[PDB]
Amino acid sequence: SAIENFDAHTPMMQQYLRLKAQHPEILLFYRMGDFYELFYDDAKRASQLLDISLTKRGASAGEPIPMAGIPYHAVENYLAKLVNQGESVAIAEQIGDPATSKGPVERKVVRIVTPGTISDEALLQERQDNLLAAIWQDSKGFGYATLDISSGRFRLSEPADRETMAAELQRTNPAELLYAEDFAEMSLIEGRRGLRRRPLWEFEIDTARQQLNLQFGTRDLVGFGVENAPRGLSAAGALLQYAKCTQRTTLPHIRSITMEREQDSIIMDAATRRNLEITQNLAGGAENTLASVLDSTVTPMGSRMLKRWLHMPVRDTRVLLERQQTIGALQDFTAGLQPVLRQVGDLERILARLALRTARPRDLARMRHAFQQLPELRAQLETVDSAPVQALREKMGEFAELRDLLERAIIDTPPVLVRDGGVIASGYNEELDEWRALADGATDYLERLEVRERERTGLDTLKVGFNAVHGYYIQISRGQSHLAPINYMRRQTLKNAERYIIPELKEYEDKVLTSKGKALALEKQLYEELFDLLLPHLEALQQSASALAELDVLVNLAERAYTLNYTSPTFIDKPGIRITEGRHPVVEQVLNEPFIANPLNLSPQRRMLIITGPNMGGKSTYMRQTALIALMAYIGSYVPAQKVEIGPIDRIFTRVGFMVEMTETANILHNATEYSLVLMDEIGRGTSTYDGLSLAWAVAENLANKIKALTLFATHYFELTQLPEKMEGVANVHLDALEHGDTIAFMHSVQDGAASKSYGLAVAALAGVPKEVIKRARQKLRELESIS
Amino acid sequence: SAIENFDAHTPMMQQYLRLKAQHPEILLFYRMGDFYELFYDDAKRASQLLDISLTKRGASAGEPIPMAGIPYHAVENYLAKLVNQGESVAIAEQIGDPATSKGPVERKVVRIVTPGTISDEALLQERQDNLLAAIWQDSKGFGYATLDISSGRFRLSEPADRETMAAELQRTNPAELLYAEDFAEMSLIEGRRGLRRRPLWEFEIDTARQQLNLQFGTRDLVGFGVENAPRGLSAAGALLQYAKCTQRTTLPHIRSITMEREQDSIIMDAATRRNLEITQNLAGGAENTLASVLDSTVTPMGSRMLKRWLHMPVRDTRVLLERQQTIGALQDFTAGLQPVLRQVGDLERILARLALRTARPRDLARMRHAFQQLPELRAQLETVDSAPVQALREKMGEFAELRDLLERAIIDTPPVLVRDGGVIASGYNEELDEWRALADGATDYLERLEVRERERTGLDTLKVGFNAVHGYYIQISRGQSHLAPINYMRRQTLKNAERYIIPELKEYEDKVLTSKGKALALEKQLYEELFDLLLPHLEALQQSASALAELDVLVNLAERAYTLNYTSPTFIDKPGIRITEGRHPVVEQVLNEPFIANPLNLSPQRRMLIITGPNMGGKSTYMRQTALIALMAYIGSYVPAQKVEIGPIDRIFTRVGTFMVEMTETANILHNATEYSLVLMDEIGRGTSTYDGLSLAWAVAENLANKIKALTLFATHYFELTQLPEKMEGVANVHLDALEHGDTIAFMHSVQDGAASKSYGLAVAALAGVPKEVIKRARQKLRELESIS
DNA sequence: GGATCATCGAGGATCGAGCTCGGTG
DNA sequence: CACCGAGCTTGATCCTCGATGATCC
Ligand SMILES: Nc1ncnc2c1ncn2[C@@H]1O[C@H](COP(=O)(O)OP(=O)(O)O)[C@@H](O)[C@H]1O
DSSP, rough: OOOOOTTOOOOHHHHHHHHHTTSSSSSEEEETTTEEEEHHHHHHHHHHTTTTEEEEEOOOOSSOEEEEEEEEEEEEEEEHHHTTOOOEEEEEOSSSGGGGGGSSOEEEEEEEEETTTTOOOOOOOOOOOEEEEEEEOOOOEEEEEEETTTTTEEEOOOSHHHHHHHHHHHHHOSSSEETTTTTGGGGGGBBBBSEEEOSSSSGGGHHHHHHHHHHHTOOOOOTTTOOOOOHHHHHHHHHHHHHTTSSSOOOTTTTOOEEOTTTTTTOHHHHHHTTTTSSTTTOOTTTTTTHHHOOOOOSSSHHHHHHHHHHSSSSOHHEEEEEEHHHHHHHHHHHHHHHHHHHHHOOHHHHHHHTTTTTOOOHHHHHHHHTTTHHHHHHHHHHHHHHHHHHHHHHHHHHHHHHHHHHHHSSSSSOSSTTTTTBOOOTOOOHHHHHHHHHEEEEEEEEHHHHHHHHHHTTTOEEEETTEEEEEEEEEHHHHTTOOOOTTTEEEEETTTEEEEHHHHHHHHHHHHHHHHHHHHHHHHHHHHHHHHGGHHHHHHHHHHHHHHHHHHHHHHHHHHHHHBBOOEEEOOOOEEEEEEEEOOHHHHSSSSSSEEEEEEEEEEEEEEEEEEEEEEEHHHHHHHHHHHHHHHHHTOSSSEEEEOOOOEEEEEEEOOOHHHHHHHHHHHHHOOOEEEEESOOOOSSSSSSSSHHHHHHHHHHHIIIIOOEEEEEEEEEEGHHHHSSSTEEEEEEEEEOOOSSEEEEEEEEESSSOOOOHHHHHHHTTOOOOHHHHHHHHHHHHHHHHH | OOOOOOSOOOOOHHHHHHHHTTTTSSSSEETTTTEEEEEEEHHHHHHHHHHEEEEEEEESSOOOOOEEETTTTHHHHHHHHTTTTTTOEEEEEEEEEEGGSSSSSOOOEEEEOOSSOOTTTTTTTTSSSOOEEEEEEEESOEEEEEEEETTTTTEEEEEESSHHHHHHHHHHHSSSSETTTTTOOOOTTTTTTSEEEOOOOOOOOHHHHHHHHHTTTOSSTTTTTTOOOHHHHHHHHHHHHHHHHHSSOTTOOOOOOEEEOOTOEEEEEEEEEEEETSOTTSSSOTTHHHHHHHHHSHHHHHHHHHHHHSOOOOOHHHHHHHHHHHHHHHHHTTTHHHHHHHHSSSSHHHHHHHTTTTTOOOHHHHHHHHHHTTTHHHHHHHHHHHHHHOOOHHHHHHHHHHHHHHHHOOOOSSSOOOOTTOOOOTTTTTTHHHHHHHHHHHHHHHHHHHHHHHHHHHTOOOOEEEETTTTEEEEEOOHTTTTTTTTTTTEEEETTTEEEEEEHHHHHHHHHHHHHHHHHHHHHHHHHHHHHGGGHHHHHHHHHHHHHHHHHHHHHHHHHHHHHTTTOEOOOOOEEEEEEEEEEHHHHHHHHHHOEEEEEETTTTTTEEEHHHOOOOTTHHHHHHHHHHHHTTTTTOOBSSEEEEEEEHHHHHHHHOOOOHHHHHHHHHHHHHOOEEEEEEESSSOOOHHHHHHHHHHHHIIIIIIIIIIIIEOOOOOOOOOHHHHHEEEEEEEEEEEEOOOOOOOEEEEEEEEEEEEEEHHHHHHHHTHHHHHHHHHHHHHHHHTTTO
């Protein structure tokens, strides 16, 4: 090993060292001319992650530095790979003037690209939330906070237990997860993506309160109703500090925080969320999910918002009623609204780039286009007699000042980057128009010169061209090169051409580049100026984008409710579910022939249903569709049924069927209430004769008589059909099956009472089993059936 | 839409539409300068499959032509993406010089890259078989053939029924599958990859017999013992014609064909193959598979061969005994052999590229390196008292003539491609040495000219460089450019440099170019010449590579047997399995908590074992370890046990682990199982009601015991079936106990006689932390029902 | 029909600062 | 005796020649 003390290294490597010292463990994109160079294990790692060239740079103090570098103009395709990989990156830039820097130029880490704090369009997934979360454990319980950097949506929670925390982890699904060093239950977290171990002092309450009050500009957090959540504030404080470190600027879009209380939303355990296949089927794909069907939103921001609504069913009936009324009122206006809403696009993530001062020309172009739709939206909504519509129409705003600003400032279709100019429009700044006049005098001036010089010289091959390196020139063919006027000054020789410069041309070249340099520098002044003019209205713009997004969701759900023939569910104060011709919203759309609709009647006098009938009969589907109907009822959406009356639901507990089973069941029985919805799916793996059955008789008895939760208890055990005999508030239903020889047809139709027989025989007869074996099974069944 | 008729297009585009007509449905890599361009539908699909630039050609024919292209020197990495997606590609090349062609230059489809016919190293997966297969359906039965284009392994079969065909499909797992137009049961092949629909006349017997006899140079196929397989020959005939069509070349490595007979191999259905996790766990991954553990072979060729052996367990006792004896004789020699075998590498797929005349420089280098190891292998095997070892040592050969040839011909480490020459070594060819001596003697002249011109001019920045377009030049800095001698003729100006030429430099440039062009052209003559000298010994080299591959498998299994402490299984004439301290070969290695070994006694007096107890990955494992032990016993390998006696096994049925799929697998077992069959039933009847599930399991257990009399390990939760041994003979009760003590449970993976006498679903629920009232309710209600039993 | 005129690919230096060597006045 | 003036150091990016075919009045 060579001696690598601070003094022995070169001045640029010493500058790299202290910047790298403030980011020891993450890759440092070090701006070096036109290339973000990395060094040592950052270069060799970058080389392996990005598939780029690992070169080296000569050092005079032992080890030549392992070097890997990326052009500043191709940096995003390599960050895309890293951000996909759950990798944090600090972007160091050249700041100062090279002409007045004898040693290394002034450099700064201006932003850290992390998997939960990315705003750039190309890095993010169009229709997926990308949330940066913080978790924190105490002796008492858990403290949690999630921030959508690209909307400024910062939410909080204090999960009571380990099981609730695992349900919140799965619900939110953080892209980057900050956790404290004294975190005990590592089993919840270890193996999750974007895992960042941080010190304890980052989770200090006094620093958190100060930082959050400062950010919101409030005296206390009484206004937000999070003053009495010290656990959740500790997480939010660590998160905000991390967010202001990954940007090293103010986050003005973060003006508010809301608490997601246990009684505010329906708490669905990890199994339920997976079993219902909300945004993720059990295989991990996005096909045959509740999102894929319900999500026909015309904006990605609405897509996420609807997907956000699906993840968290709201229990506040007032919000739900307003959505139900709205969906009903807008159902007639969908055709006219959707094509207008479609043009708005992803305005949410554009405002994030405005707030972070990272917005690109076409972000401002789409924002301008979004404002141009507001009048047509305001016009089409004015007649809709609905208080919530008029509330979101007022919240929508106008922004006539900002609409005029962008219309004057920016051209119709600017390029991707301001770097190469041509973004600010003509008339806005008449100094800029003057600087451009010289730059765009080339079409006539240099063409006029070409004619004069061609006619004057009498060299027919004479043509005026430009070259990025050498600048402008007069080009003559090799054959006619020696005949050039003596006033022509040799500049560039080519294989079959000679390129010259004349006093009038070098005057032009000197002035056309100094004009470009001025025009370009002023454009970037006027560009950074637009942020100064737009940031003050960010509050109104966020509420506007939030209102437009919410409109897209409810216009979509209005389209879906009409197209797929859904109805409005009504609410009662006490527990119960009365469905009439209820369907599975996903399965009926994916399988291309009519799904068989079924009713439901759950009440305190009829709270448990013992569901018999054959497997692959849609027994599991019927219980799922109920939870999905309950989900969609408590997102404020219309439901796939002819009629639904539903009571308050605090939790949905689902067990689909070993160790994990009995564990999930125990969690259900402990934490379930009368208001809880329970779906038991033939849960049982008995290690003896009735070991499984005996447990399902005692679990069904407990749920019915002790907890008294609304339950759909699907079971293959035929002995459980004797529970209604001895237990009150327990009833038998079954999915009918029709035997017709060596085959069986599944009706998928729920009937009262227990199924006439079991169909293990029928399934075996369809397997094509020898007749003596079948006749033996029919004989031996009647022997054992005789025992009861 | 604008008219794209044949006449309106350019002669070049007409030449594309000519050759594209002979390949209507597959992507055509059209060589266009230094780019394999595609056009119209081919360019937009390629753009979407490869993630390349979809560009356009300015045309005289209406719609501007959708164009997508890849450089000729980068073709492979893009073919890799296509052939692993199951995409066939025709590679069209420029053959003539375009400058002396009045119309478009003469072009040719030299090879078709198809998923089952890839010869190139980069396209193939190192340690996975890539079979081109042909299937046909007849009024009589099924006809099948598989070709490993790389190994020269040509196989055929006439699967007995629909079930055997599905088992053969899954076993072979063809990369490309040829099937006839009158193929009825499409359900067998419905979702399979690389599906090619072909006409029926390609499956004509007289054409097949003629083509196969021609290829092997035989009068009849009596020699191969495939003369009385008309169905299998029809498939093989269509397959050979397709293989010749894809290469457009003779296949001299295809000299032999072997039949996969029904009585030669243990028939395992698709479920068994998946459930045992041989090369593929149920999740589809390569981890916790029999291959991943047993495959410590030092060559990919050996890796595939061992993997091929695992897929097809042989019943010929003579082959197994030779492997068992060999593995035993190699045990003490392993340490010295494996590092030598490791250097051989993938010689099998290299010989494929030799036979197809597609071999790349480093393929010839690794072949030379493989020959250099033969003497050391032959030396270390010399004393091994084993007829099969000495048989494979003789079959190995020497090739001292070919070893010397390649040592003289080719340099130590050539580049990846012949394109830029520098492959043929100095001394081999006196003409080559002359063409290079001029190329390097000009290089030293032009370096000496740099010194002369530097001293003469007095310009310190003066530097002699080279450029593909310009050739050579003299480079001076912009500051010192005007001081250049007047005889210096400016050619190229740069930002801070000027490049010149003199008649003395272009005299020397004329020598370097003519030296290059001749040296390069002659190198490719001497390169194509090496194939002419090597092809004649291909038969001996295939037998050599086959012997080396087989040695690597048996050296590996000898290493594994010694390292993992396996023993040699002995065979009896009638069915039975007597294991002493048998282990699961995978699970014991993956979990570093020491595995609990157990015996087995299956016989006609003890055919069915009713296995009770908590499963906890010890009941399913115990049944699967038996099938794996039976697998490894009939691959000729040592087995994870202290002693094993095993009888003949014709099939292995595993319904271990949708309830409809279970009853389907079970139905297939009961229909086709014999006394020689091994059956593993894992708590079937789970999904349907208490009584109906039990009723089926009773009927199935009674049928298997009394009617079929197959060797069965019948795992169940149903405790009523533990009364079967009371009634009838050849049925016995065993169980895995668990020991309750406080707030913990010890799950014993140790097999005991009799039926389990306790419930532990209560105990596991009590550890889950279930309320005691619910537990006591379950125990209360159980004792009410169990006391009546 | 024959000088004239597209068109796609191949290299290729540059982009641009920074450290190091090399004179150098 | 410091101080200018050269070297080369990652993937895009024009840029121009190469090589070729196409052209059409
Ligand atoms: N009510 C229904 N109408 C039509 N098809 C249905 C219905 N219920 C279920 N199915 C179909 O049957 C399949 C099996 O349903 P599932 O609830 O999984 O059955 P089980 O739990 O009995 O195995 C579903 O994928 C769906 O395609």
